[PDB]
Design an enzyme around this catalytic site. Structure first.
Site, PDB file in Angstrom:
ATOM      1  CE  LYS A 139      -0.777  -4.620  -4.992  1.00 32.91           C
ATOM      2  NZ  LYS A 139      -0.904  -4.247  -6.424  1.00 32.91           N
TER       3      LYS A 139
ATOM      4  NE  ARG B 296      -0.968 -10.891  -7.117  1.00 27.84           N
ATOM      5  CZ  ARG B 296       0.295 -10.498  -6.985  1.00 27.84           C
ATOM      6  NH1 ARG B 296       0.889 -10.552  -5.801  1.00 27.84           N
ATOM      7  NH2 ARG B 296       0.962 -10.043  -8.033  1.00 27.84           N
TER       8      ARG B 296
ATOM      9  NE  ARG C 126       7.454  -2.738 -11.218  1.00 26.48           N
ATOM     10  CZ  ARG C 126       6.504  -3.580 -10.826  1.00 26.48           C
ATOM     11  NH1 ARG C 126       5.832  -3.344  -9.707  1.00 26.48           N
ATOM     12  NH2 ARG C 126       6.225  -4.655 -11.551  1.00 26.48           N
TER      13      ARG C 126
ATOM     14  NE  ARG D 201       9.148  -7.106 -10.667  1.00 22.12           N
ATOM     15  CZ  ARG D 201       7.895  -7.061 -10.232  1.00 22.12           C
ATOM     16  NH1 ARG D 201       7.531  -6.140  -9.349  1.00 22.12           N
ATOM     17  NH2 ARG D 201       7.004  -7.935 -10.677  1.00 22.12           N
TER      18      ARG D 201
ATOM     19  NE  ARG E 277       3.147  -8.383 -13.182  1.00 24.64           N
ATOM     20  CZ  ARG E 277       4.287  -8.097 -13.805  1.00 24.64           C
ATOM     21  NH1 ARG E 277       4.976  -9.061 -14.399  1.00 24.64           N
ATOM     22  NH2 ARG E 277       4.737  -6.853 -13.840  1.00 24.64           N
TER      23      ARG E 277
HETATM   24  N1  LIG Z   1       0.692   7.376  -7.166  1.00 21.50           N
HETATM   25  C1  LIG Z   1       1.505   7.080  -8.343  1.00 21.50           C
HETATM   26  N2  LIG Z   1       1.374   7.807  -9.403  1.00 21.50           N
HETATM   27  C2  LIG Z   1       2.174   7.531 -10.612  1.00 21.50           C
HETATM   28  N3  LIG Z   1       3.042   6.526 -10.607  1.00 21.50           N
HETATM   29  C3  LIG Z   1       3.182   5.758  -9.489  1.00 21.50           C
HETATM   30  C4  LIG Z   1       2.417   6.019  -8.335  1.00 21.50           C
HETATM   31  N4  LIG Z   1       2.772   5.076  -7.358  1.00 21.50           N
HETATM   32  C5  LIG Z   1       3.802   4.185  -7.935  1.00 21.50           C
HETATM   33  N5  LIG Z   1       4.047   4.598  -9.208  1.00 21.50           N
HETATM   34  C6  LIG Z   1       5.021   4.026 -10.187  1.00 21.50           C
HETATM   35  O1  LIG Z   1       4.381   3.095 -11.059  1.00 21.50           O
HETATM   36  C7  LIG Z   1       4.986   1.776 -10.871  1.00 21.50           C
HETATM   37  C8  LIG Z   1       4.205   0.798  -9.985  1.00 21.50           C
HETATM   38  O2  LIG Z   1       4.325   1.108  -8.625  1.00 21.50           O
HETATM   39  P1  LIG Z   1       4.242  -0.123  -7.524  1.00 21.50           P
HETATM   40  O3  LIG Z   1       4.426   0.439  -5.989  1.00 21.50           O
HETATM   41  O4  LIG Z   1       5.295  -1.075  -7.858  1.00 21.50           O
HETATM   42  O5  LIG Z   1       2.731  -0.806  -7.684  1.00 21.50           O
HETATM   43  P2  LIG Z   1       2.402  -2.267  -6.976  1.00 21.50           P
HETATM   44  O6  LIG Z   1       0.846  -2.265  -6.422  1.00 21.50           O
HETATM   45  O7  LIG Z   1       3.324  -2.569  -5.888  1.00 21.50           O
HETATM   46  O8  LIG Z   1       2.582  -3.342  -8.198  1.00 21.50           O
HETATM   47  P3  LIG Z   1       2.872  -4.961  -7.965  1.00 21.50           P
HETATM   48  O9  LIG Z   1       4.484  -5.254  -7.637  1.00 21.50           O
HETATM   49  O10 LIG Z   1       2.026  -5.477  -6.887  1.00 21.50           O
HETATM   50  O11 LIG Z   1       2.452  -5.605  -9.431  1.00 21.50           O
HETATM   51  P4  LIG Z   1       3.270  -6.878 -10.062  1.00 21.50           P
HETATM   52  O12 LIG Z   1       2.248  -8.157 -10.260  1.00 21.50           O
HETATM   53  O13 LIG Z   1       3.765  -6.478 -11.371  1.00 21.50           O
HETATM   54  O14 LIG Z   1       4.551  -7.225  -9.039  1.00 21.50           O
HETATM   55  P5  LIG Z   1       4.414  -8.359  -7.839  1.00 21.50           P
HETATM   56  O15 LIG Z   1       5.887  -8.603  -7.170  1.00 21.50           O
HETATM   57  O16 LIG Z   1       3.455  -7.918  -6.827  1.00 21.50           O
HETATM   58  O17 LIG Z   1       3.946  -9.811  -8.483  1.00 21.50           O
HETATM   59  C9  LIG Z   1       4.785 -10.391  -9.452  1.00 21.50           C
HETATM   60  C10 LIG Z   1       4.726 -11.938  -9.571  1.00 21.50           C
HETATM   61  O18 LIG Z   1       5.237 -12.761  -8.433  1.00 21.50           O
HETATM   62  C11 LIG Z   1       4.295 -13.814  -8.180  1.00 21.50           C
HETATM   63  N6  LIG Z   1       3.518 -13.558  -6.949  1.00 21.50           N
HETATM   64  C12 LIG Z   1       3.687 -12.510  -6.113  1.00 21.50           C
HETATM   65  N7  LIG Z   1       2.779 -12.669  -5.003  1.00 21.50           N
HETATM   66  C13 LIG Z   1       2.036 -13.876  -5.205  1.00 21.50           C
HETATM   67  C14 LIG Z   1       1.012 -14.519  -4.436  1.00 21.50           C
HETATM   68  N8  LIG Z   1       0.556 -13.934  -3.180  1.00 21.50           N
HETATM   69  N9  LIG Z   1       0.474 -15.666  -4.859  1.00 21.50           N
HETATM   70  C15 LIG Z   1       0.921 -16.258  -6.087  1.00 21.50           C
HETATM   71  N10 LIG Z   1       1.889 -15.649  -6.816  1.00 21.50           N
HETATM   72  C16 LIG Z   1       2.462 -14.437  -6.370  1.00 21.50           C
HETATM   73  C17 LIG Z   1       3.509 -14.034  -9.439  1.00 21.50           C
HETATM   74  O19 LIG Z   1       4.033 -14.959 -10.375  1.00 21.50           O
HETATM   75  C18 LIG Z   1       3.310 -12.598  -9.897  1.00 21.50           C
HETATM   76  O20 LIG Z   1       2.776 -12.364 -11.184  1.00 21.50           O
HETATM   77  C19 LIG Z   1       6.418   2.108 -10.415  1.00 21.50           C
HETATM   78  O21 LIG Z   1       7.428   2.182 -11.398  1.00 21.50           O
HETATM   79  C20 LIG Z   1       6.196   3.340  -9.486  1.00 21.50           C
HETATM   80  O22 LIG Z   1       7.307   4.103  -9.099  1.00 21.50           O
END
Ligand SMILES: Nc1ncnc2c1ncn2[C@@H]1O[C@H](COP(=O)(O)OP(=O)(O)OP(=O)(O)OP(=O)(O)OP(=O)(O)OC[C@H]2O[C@@H](n3cnc4c(N)ncnc43)[C@H](O)[C@@H]2O)[C@@H](O)[C@H]1O
Length: 214
Positions: A13, A88, A123, A156, A167
């Site tokens: 995403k 979320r 990542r 991270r 997660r």
């Molecule tokens: N097409 C492809 N093919 C092959 N490889 C590819 C590819 N596209 C990308 N890749 C590679 O594969 C990897 C993934 O790509 P990537 O673009 O990072 O995928 P993503 O959908 O963005 O992953 P997220 O960041 O959403 O998952 P997360 O829960 O771990 O992090 P978040 O900050 O959101 O959440 C983290 C934490 O913060 C908190 N939090 C965040 N938002 C909320 C909310 N709204 N409510 C409550 N808590 C929240 C929570 O505590 C939570 O657990 C990379 O290394 C990339 O280069």
């Protein structure tokens, strides 16, 4: 134009959000990036998020809602915005709905569980911007350096296999129901809904999304 990105952790995403933002001149609103920055700078609103993200647990609805409504009142969100990580939970979605915030597109990324761990462990991010890379699947032009600023990438603290497993569990329990939520919204004529194959190469998913948005 207003957009919401749906999908499991590591679905791609944030990666694809970069392209939409540049093409449509709308800001990416990443709750994950805000929370990490709040921890980093010790911002009153969000500072508390450190331990929760560590445990692979979701942060409270109220904290994130506040972060989003603060961020989204910003001027750069006049002509639209892209929500990435919000909503979320169901209550998060409902909070936004009754505030009178409707979007034009809800975009779901379809990615199998078995791919998530190896994605997250590889990542590497540019913290100041939120830009994301993968050491094998999507490397920077120059190893360990951000393409745009050339600054050193980092990993991270919560991108370890065990934390990733947690997660995932949280997502299927708390976040997956948002698919039906917005499918329902779409059928009400309140928005458009679409799903893409998130296992395609980055370039191809970007092309697919552009066919839907452009
Ligand atoms: N097409 C492809 N093919 C092959 N490889 C590819 C590819 N596209 C990308 N890749 C590679 O594969 C990897 C993934 O790509 P990537 O673009 O990072 O995928 P993503 O959908 O963005 O992953 P997220 O960041 O959403 O998952 P997360 O829960 O771990 O992090 P978040 O900050 O959101 O959440 C983290 C934490 O913060 C908190 N939090 C965040 N938002 C909320 C909310 N709204 N409510 C409550 N808590 C929240 C929570 O505590 C939570 O657990 C990379 O290394 C990339 O280069």
């Amino acid at each position: 134009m207003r957009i919401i990105l749906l999908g499991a952790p590591g679905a791609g995403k944030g990666t694809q959000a970069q392209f939409i933002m540049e093409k449509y001149g709308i800001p990416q609103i990443s709750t994950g990036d805000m929370l990490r920055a709040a921890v980093k700078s010790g911002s009153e609103l969000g500072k508390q998020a450190k331990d929760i993200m560590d445990a692979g647990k979701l942060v409270t609805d109220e904290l994130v809602i506040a972060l989003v409504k603060e961020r989204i009142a910003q001027e750069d969100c006049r002509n639209g915005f892209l929500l990435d990580g919000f909503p979320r939970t169901i209550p998060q979605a409902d909070a936004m709905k009754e505030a009178g915030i409707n979007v034009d597109y809800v975009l779901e990324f379809d990615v199998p569980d078995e791919l998530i761990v190896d994605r997250i462990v590889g990542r590497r991010v540019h913290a100041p911007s939120g830009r994301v890379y993968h050491v094998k699947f999507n490397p920077p032009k120059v190893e360990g350096k951000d393409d745009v600023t050339g600054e050193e990438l980092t990993t991270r603290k919560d991108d370890q296999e065990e934390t990733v497993r947690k997660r995932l569990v949280e997502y299927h329990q708390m976040t997956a129901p948002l698919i039906g939520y917005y499918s329902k919204e779409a059928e009400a004529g309140n928005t458009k809904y679409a799903k893409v194959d998130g296992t395609k190469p980055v370039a191809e998913v970007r092309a697919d999304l552009e066919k839907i948005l452009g």
